[PDB]
Amino acid sequence: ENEDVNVELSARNIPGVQVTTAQGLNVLDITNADSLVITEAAAKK
Amino acid sequence: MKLHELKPAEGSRKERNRVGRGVATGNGKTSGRGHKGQKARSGGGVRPGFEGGQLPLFRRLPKRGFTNINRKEYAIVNLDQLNKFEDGTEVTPALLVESGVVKNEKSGIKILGNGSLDKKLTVKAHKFSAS
Amino acid sequence: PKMKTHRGAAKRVKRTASGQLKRSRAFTSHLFANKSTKQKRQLRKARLVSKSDMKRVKQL
RNA sequence: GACUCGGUGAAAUCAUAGUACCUGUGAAGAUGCAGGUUACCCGCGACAGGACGGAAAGACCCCGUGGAGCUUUACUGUAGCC
RNA sequence: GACAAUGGUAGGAGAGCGUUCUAAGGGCGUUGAAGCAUGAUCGUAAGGACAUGUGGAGCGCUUAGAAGUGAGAAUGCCGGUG
RNA sequence: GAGGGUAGCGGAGAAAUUCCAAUCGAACCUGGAGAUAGCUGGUUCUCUCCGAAAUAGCUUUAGGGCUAGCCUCAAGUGAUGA
RNA sequence: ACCGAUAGUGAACCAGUACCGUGAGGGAAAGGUGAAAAGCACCCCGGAAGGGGAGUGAAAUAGAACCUGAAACCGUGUGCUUACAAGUAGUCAGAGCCCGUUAAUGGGUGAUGGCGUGCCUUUUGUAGAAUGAACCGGCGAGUUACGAUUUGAUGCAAGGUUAAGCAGUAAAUGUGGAGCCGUAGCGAAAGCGAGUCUGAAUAGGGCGUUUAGUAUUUGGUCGUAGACCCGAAACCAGGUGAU
RNA sequence: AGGACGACAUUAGACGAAUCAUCUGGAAAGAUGAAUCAAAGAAGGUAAUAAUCCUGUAGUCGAAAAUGUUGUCUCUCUUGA
Numbered sequence: 001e002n003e004d005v006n007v008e009l010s011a012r013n014i015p016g017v018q019v020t021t022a023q024g025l026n027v028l029d030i031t032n033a034d035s036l037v038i039t040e041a042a043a044k045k
Numbered sequence: 046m047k048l049h050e051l052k053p054a055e056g057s058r059k060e061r062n063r064v065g066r067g068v069a070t071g072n073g074k075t076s077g078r079g080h081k082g083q084k085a086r087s088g089g090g091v092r093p094g095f096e097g098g099q100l101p102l103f104r105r106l107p108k109r110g111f112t113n114i115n116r117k118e119y120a121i122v123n124l125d126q127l128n129k130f131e132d133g134t135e136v137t138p139a140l141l142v143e144s145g146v147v148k149n150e151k152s153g154i155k156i157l158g159n160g161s162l163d164k165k166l167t168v169k170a171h172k173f174s175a176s
Numbered sequence: 177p178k179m180k181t182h183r184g185a186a187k188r189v190k191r192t193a194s195g196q197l198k199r200s201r202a203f204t205s206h207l208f209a210n211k212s213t214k215q216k217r218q219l220r221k222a223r224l225v226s227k228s229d230m231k232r233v234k235q236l
Numbered sequence: 237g238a239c240u241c242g243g244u245g246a247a248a249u250c251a252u253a254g255u256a257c258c259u260g261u262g263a264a265g266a267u268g269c270a271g272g273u274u275a276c277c278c279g280c281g282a283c284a285g286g287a288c289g290g291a292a293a294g295a296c297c298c299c300g301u302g303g304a305g306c307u308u309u310a311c312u313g314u315a316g317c318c
Numbered sequence: 319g320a321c322a323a324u325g326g327u328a329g330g331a332g333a334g335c336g337u338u339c340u341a342a343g344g345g346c347g348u349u350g351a352a353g354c355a356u357g358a359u360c361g362u363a364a365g366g367a368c369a370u371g372u373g374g375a376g377c378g379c380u381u382a383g384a385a386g387u388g389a390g391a392a393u394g395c396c397g398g399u400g
Numbered sequence: 401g402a403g404g405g406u407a408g409c410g411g412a413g414a415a416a417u418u419c420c421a422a423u424c425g426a427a428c429c430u431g432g433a434g435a436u437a438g439c440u441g442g443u444u445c446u447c448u449c450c451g452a453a454a455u456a457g458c459u460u461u462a463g464g465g466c467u468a469g470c471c472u473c474a475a476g477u478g479a480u481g482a
Numbered sequence: 483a484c485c486g487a488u489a490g491u492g493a494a495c496c497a498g499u500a501c502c503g504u505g506a507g508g509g510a511a512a513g514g515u516g517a518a519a520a521g522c523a524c525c526c527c528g529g530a531a532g533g534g535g536a537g538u539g540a541a542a543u544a545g546a547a548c549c550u551g552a553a554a555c556c557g558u559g560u561g562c563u564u565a566c567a568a569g570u571a572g573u574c575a576g577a578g579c580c581c582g583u584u585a586a587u588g589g590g591u592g593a594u595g596g597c598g599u600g601c602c603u604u605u606u607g608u609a610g611a612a613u614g615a616a617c618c619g620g621c622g623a624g625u626u627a628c629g630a631u632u633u634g635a636u637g638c639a640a641g642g643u644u645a646a647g648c649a650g651u652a653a654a655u656g657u658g659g660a661g662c663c664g665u666a667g668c669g670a671a672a673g674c675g676a677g678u679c680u681g682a683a684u685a686g687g688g689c690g691u692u693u694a695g696u697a698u699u700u701g702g703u704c705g706u707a708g709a710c711c712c713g714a715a716a717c718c719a720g721g722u723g724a725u
Numbered sequence: 726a727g728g729a730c731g732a733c734a735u736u737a738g739a740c741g742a743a744u745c746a747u748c749u750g751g752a753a754a755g756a757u758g759a760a761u762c763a764a765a766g767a768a769g770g771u772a773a774u775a776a777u778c779c780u781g782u783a784g785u786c787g788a789a790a791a792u793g794u795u796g797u798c799u800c801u802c803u804u805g806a
């Protein structure tokens with residue numbers, strides 16, 4: 001929360017990684033798994 | 046896949062038939078003619094006027110039944126049995142080791158009811174078991 | 177609703193695909209036909225499995 | 237009453253109509269087809285041959301494993317009575 | 319490039335047109351949307367545009383999704399007018 | 401004439417199946433209820449390819465149905481077809 | 483990824499209301515000026531209604547019966563045509579006259595000639611004198627759920643797969659392996675098992691072994707449901723009626 | 726088996742960020758220019774289509790009273806193996 005309150009900025013959306021929809025992921029045009037997260041999605045195959 | 050360029054897998058999905066919408070379509074009687082192609086439409090369920098889904102009967106049933114593991118028990122390493130419910134077997138009313146294939150290992154066959162030929166092959170290797 | 181199974185098929189039993197079947201004229205009037213009598217043997221359907229298909233079919 | 241004028245102004249019917257006759261033809265009795273024969277265009281008053289005229293999904297007849305009312309030593313029951 | 323096939327009712331199979339809603343993208347609109355009207359326009363068909371008039375505020379297009387998705391006949395129901 | 405009583409598996413009938421709120425061999429209203437209808441009628445866009453049957457068998461069956469036969473789509477066999 | 487005024491509540495409007503019935507009961511139709519009432523001062527014809535000016539307004543060719551304003555239907559004007567002709571009304575051929583387009587081997591009309599008995603339904607066969615429709619408009623019929631089966635598609639594969647529940651925004655999503663199908667079949671069964679059943683048989687014969695399944699799902703079809711749509715005469719139950 | 730001391734919630738509400746110019750126009754929220762806010766780009770309105778014109782929205786604050794639910798003291802009733 002806070003990072004999430006980059007919310008009302010039109011095009012942006014911002015979930016967890018145990019989140020991660022099939023759609024939100026590719027309505028998307030660009031993504032930015034941060035680092036910890038990138039390592040977890042990497043961990044949860 | 047870019048959400049405005051979705052394309053469904055080739056050969057999956059095909060438009061449903063819509064009967065009764067026109068004549069060029071090939072379906073305006075819709076189907077049948079004159080008969081019991083009426084709405085209720087009951088054929089009967091499976092019948093003619095002479096009941097052949099019945100001639101006589103033969104039956105009974107008591108409690109029993111096992112679960113078959115063939116002498117393709119040659120998958121697992123060495124010693125032991127019944128444990129392989131964590132390797133390759135699922136539901137077991139009781140666990141019988143049958144013959145078939147040809148054994149290639151020396152291992153304890155701890156199981157309820159050993160098929161005879163299988164017993165000769167498992168014992169020809171080394172181990173045997175019961176109960 | 178799951179279709180109800182016909183119970184009058186306590187009269188066949190599944191083979192592998194095909195249904196094994198009861199026969200003919202066992203019991204009553206055995207005072208006739210003798211080679212006939214040795215017709216304790218099975219059946220199937222062929223033309224009829226078309227008719228009875230999905231009724232004895234939760235018999236898998 | 238009809239009829240002429242002034243006033244008011246419905247209806248059942250009706251696939252579109254520029255809707256003749258004879259001898260045929262044809263689902264076997266044709267304004268509508270064939271071959272002839274007759275006929276300038278548009279009204280008004282009249283008649284009832286035809287449009288298998290209109291009106292009512294034939295009441296007779298048969299059919300449906302339709303209905304209903306009634307009968308009886310048809311079947312199975314039952315209120316009551318001995 | 320030759321060479322074949324292509325009448326068709328019940329009915330099987332195939333490819334498509336148009337409607338409303340939705341998603342994503344991409345656009346049009348008071349310098350005039352939809353609708354309505356008219357045209358000598360385009361495609362093998364369903365059907366698609368264009369220009370003008372009316373109108374005065376909303377609407378297409380691509381790709382995919384989903385349907386209260388297509389009317390000339392039911393003595394069909396409602397309205398209008400013969 | 402006024403005020404009353406008898407109500408549908410019921411009532412009333414100088415008896416006709418007669419009357420019970422303008423059609424009573426069993427009233428009216430609401431529900432069960434979208435009763436059931438092997439009968440009749442209706443069933444809405446387009447083009448392309450193929451294309452029947454009105455027969456046998458059994459049927460409280462005979463304008464209904466079932467299995468065969470004929471149609472189509474798909475696999476498969478592979479010269480078995482004319 | 484519900485309706486948008488014939489829809490959606492019967493009822494978007496002072497609806498259980500007009501209206502109908504003795505009663506129980508049955509039951510409608512009917513939304514929209516404009517941004518703003520600025521809702522037409524004044525003159526004119528008329529008793530008024532209504533109208534033409536003059537005005538308000540972006541617009542009244544938005545004027546109240548008011549957005550848009552299709553069709554049937556009714557009218558005024560007319561370019562071509564028609565009073566010797568037998569007509570399912572068009573089609574094919576065609577002179578004359580009139581015109582000039584989304585400019586293309588153009589548009590309107592049509593003397594005369596050839597051919598020509600609407601549609602649907604239902605039928606062995608219907609121009610049929612068999613059925614249906616006065617016209618125009620709107621409205622009007624194979625659906626959904628759950629099970630089954632089959633085909634196509636996709637993921638895994640001797641394996642495939644979760645259910646309820648818990649978690650999360652009424653989520654695509656992690657958990658949950660109870661469960662289910664499959665890897666083995668044969669016999670009524672005891673049971674035996676790549677075999678088993680019948681059989682005295684180590685004969686013959688039946689089913690079976692020679693490994694491919696399973697979950698999700700588009701389409702086809704069946705079942706359970708009203709299960710394409712409209713229609714009985716009638717049955718039953720509870721009331722309301724002897725004005 | 727009935728009643729005394731406060732927390733929270735229900736029944737009114739309050740605060741609430743940031744836009745200007747020209748074109749066309751009957752009217753601009755549109756177009757084109759430069760701007761700005763955002764824990765607020767939900768929605769509805771304003772003479773056309775508005776995050777910054779208005780009602781609001783994220784967020785924050787709030788109860789004289791009357792129920793409402795609870796934390797804990799009082800209040801009762803209690804000899805268990």
Ligand SMILES: C=C[C@]1(C)C[C@@H](OC(=O)CS[C@@H]2CC[C@@H](N)C[C@H]2O)[C@]2(C)[C@H](C)CC[C@]3(CCC(=O)[C@H]32)[C@@H](C)[C@@H]1O
Nearest residue numbers: 265286288289290291292293294295296297298611612
């Ligand atoms: C339908 C009948 C009528 C009126 C007369 C009919 O007479 C009958 O049917 C006699 S039965 C009689 C009838 C009334 C019933 N309630 C009692 C019963 O006894 C008759 C004479 C034909 C025999 C049949 C054809 C006919 C066409 C022209 C013609 O000649 C007609 C039909 C089409 C006609 O409309």
Ligand SMILES: [Mg+2]
Nearest residue numbers: 099100184187
């Ligand atoms: Mg039986």
Ligand SMILES: [Mg+2]
Nearest residue numbers: 237238239240
């Ligand atoms: Mg007189």
Ligand SMILES: [Mg+2]
Nearest residue numbers: 247248249400
């Ligand atoms: Mg009339």
Ligand SMILES: [Mg+2]
Nearest residue numbers: 254255256278
């Ligand atoms: Mg005449």
Ligand SMILES: [Mg+2]
Nearest residue numbers: 263608610612
């Ligand atoms: Mg005839």
Ligand SMILES: [Mg+2]
Nearest residue numbers: 260261265266
């Ligand atoms: Mg004759």
Ligand SMILES: [Mg+2]
Nearest residue numbers: 298299300302
């Ligand atoms: Mg009869």
Ligand SMILES: [Mg+2]
Nearest residue numbers: 314315316317
């Ligand atoms: Mg008794």
Ligand SMILES: [Mg+2]
Nearest residue numbers: 336337366378
């Ligand atoms: Mg369109």
Ligand SMILES: [Mg+2]
Nearest residue numbers: 346347351378
């Ligand atoms: Mg345009």
Ligand SMILES: [Mg+2]
Nearest residue numbers: 348350540750
């Ligand atoms: Mg203008």
Ligand SMILES: [Mg+2]
Nearest residue numbers: 355356357590
């Ligand atoms: Mg014209």
Ligand SMILES: [Mg+2]
Nearest residue numbers: 355356357359
């Ligand atoms: Mg047009």
Ligand SMILES: [Mg+2]
Nearest residue numbers: 350371372373
């Ligand atoms: Mg204009």
Ligand SMILES: [Mg+2]
Nearest residue numbers: 370371372373
């Ligand atoms: Mg226009």
